[PDB]
Amino acid sequence: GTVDKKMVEKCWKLMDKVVRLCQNPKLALKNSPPYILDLLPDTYQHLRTILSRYEGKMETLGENEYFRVFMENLMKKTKQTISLFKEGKERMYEENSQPRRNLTKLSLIFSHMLAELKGIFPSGLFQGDTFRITKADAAEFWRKAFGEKTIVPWKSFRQALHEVHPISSGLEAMALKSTIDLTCNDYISVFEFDIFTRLFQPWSSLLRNWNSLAVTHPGYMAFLTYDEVKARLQKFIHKPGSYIFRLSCTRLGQWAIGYVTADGNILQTIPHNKPLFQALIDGFREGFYLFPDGRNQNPDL
Amino acid sequence: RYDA
Ligand SMILES: [Ca+2]
Ligand SMILES: [Cl-]
Ligand SMILES: [Cl-]
Ligand SMILES: [Cl-]
Known part of the structure; x- marks a missing residue:
């Protein structure tokens, strides 16, 4: 879905609200990565850099597949975090509570999201079409299956991967999706793919490696x-x-x-x-x- | 943070 200056501004306001909630002294957030109090302002800053690089060519930015997915997810995750505070209430302030754990996982997700955005818009210009995957065999797979695409729906990624590395079951597929979909948006970006294939190298036995090191x-x-x-x-x-x-x-x-x-x-x-x-x-x-x-x-x- |  197309993105304009307005949906960005709306996302910025939701981000500020999360930051105000996360500033409550009762939470006592530690200044240590991932630190939501720096992540959100940092994501706002990089979004400003991007907008700046696209002045007078917002039309181009608004149509970029990756950017539309990213913004949709940023809005969803910020709303989710706001809903989390509203539903958790005082439980947010008990470290070790399930709602507080939910916030910590969100904080990590915002961290992965910012790292992704910076990887795909280094210096604020889109470079997803030339993103460099680190392991040569993984870069070959991505090119073969998806060409220069930056992002693909999970279903399409799963089907493509299966043809080269068989997935044995639906629950295995769901564990794999849980592992690789760092930004938790049901798409797999070339950046997420590079991360997973570095972590679970070597490519020749990719899913046997992941099964051994993570699943079990x-x-x-x-x-x-x-x-x-x-x-x-x-x-x-x-x-x-x-x-x-x-x-x-x-x-x-x-x-x-x-x-x-x-x-x-x-x-x-x-x-x-x-x-x-x-x-x-x-x-x-x-x-x-x-x-x-x-x-x-x-x-x- | 991370040591050797
Ligand atoms: Ca994702
Ligand atoms: Cl959990
Ligand atoms: Cl044991
Ligand atoms: Cl070295």
């Missing part, structure tokens, strides 16, 4: 933040070698692995130049990564 691995934590990982490993502080892992939110495309050390500290690191399987095997051997989510059985990869 007790250590994988979907839509979890740095602070949540520190809180979750706290219950295992006297159990060195307890560990979990998740997408890094500031270095999208990379894994953050948290673990309990011998001296009872919780560290988090992002492996350098090594796919997850190898990071897990190496850390298993060294005794860092032994008990996924503090459990006694660790998958043998």
